[PDB]
A paper describes a structure:
A hallmark of the COMMD family members is a highly conserved C-terminal sequence of ~70–80 amino acids called the COMM domain, which has no known structure.
We next determined the structure of the Commd9 N-terminal domain by X-ray crystallography to a resolution of 1.55 Å using multi-wavelength anomalous dispersion. We therefore refer to this domain as the HN (Helical N-terminal) domain. The overall structure of the HN domain has a similar all α-helical fold to the equivalent domain of Commd1, which was previously determined by NMR. Compared to Commd1 however, the HN domain of Commd9 has an additional α-helix at its N-terminus that packs down on top of the structure, and a large disordered loop in Commd1 is better resolved in Commd9. In Commd9 the α4 helix forms a central core element that extends the length of the HN domain. However, the topology of the five shared α-helices (α2-α6) is similar overall. Comparing the HN domains of Commd1 and Commd9 using DALI showed structural similarity (DALI Z-score >3) with an RMSD of 3.2 Å over 83 Cα atoms. The electrostatic surface of the Commd9 HN domain reveals the presence of two basic patches and a negatively charged region, but it is not clear yet what their functional significance might be.
Numbering used by the authors: -3 to 115
The structure:
């Protein structure tokens, strides 16, 4: 329990793998797929994640778990301002990656919150 209370050190470490992405669009799509997927269904995204980011299977799994948690937390708590989302992050997390993730959360939170709160 408390899954929605915080992202863990392992989550934040895993999200840093997104700096290997070849474009911002890859990050966007990984956020959307990780949200829509159940945690137990994230294994279905491993091959495309490994192949797109050139990461290990373990890096991909940890990343996908982190994105799944972050996007669900944003939806569950209705974190719908940059202020609210920025509050999740450590000071020692890459600033422009954080800003990108915040941007992407804001692009989807209204739809995500509706989808999640319906279920």
């Amino acid at each position: 329990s408390g899954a929605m209370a915080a992202l863990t050190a392992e989550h934040f470490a895993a999200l840093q793998s997104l700096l290997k992405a070849s474009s911002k669009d890859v990050v966007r799509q990984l956020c959307q797929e990780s949200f829509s997927s159940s945690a137990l269904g994230l294994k279905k995204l491993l091959d495309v994640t490994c192949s797109s980011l050139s990461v290990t299977q373990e890096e991909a799994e940890e990343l996908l778990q982190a994105l799944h948690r972050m996007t669900r937390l944003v939806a569950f708590r209705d974190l719908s301002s940059a202020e609210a989302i920025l509050a999740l992050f450590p000071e020692n997390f890459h600033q422009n990656l954080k800003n990108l993730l915040t941007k992407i959360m804001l692009e989807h939170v209204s739809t995500w919150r509706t989808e999640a709160q319906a279920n």
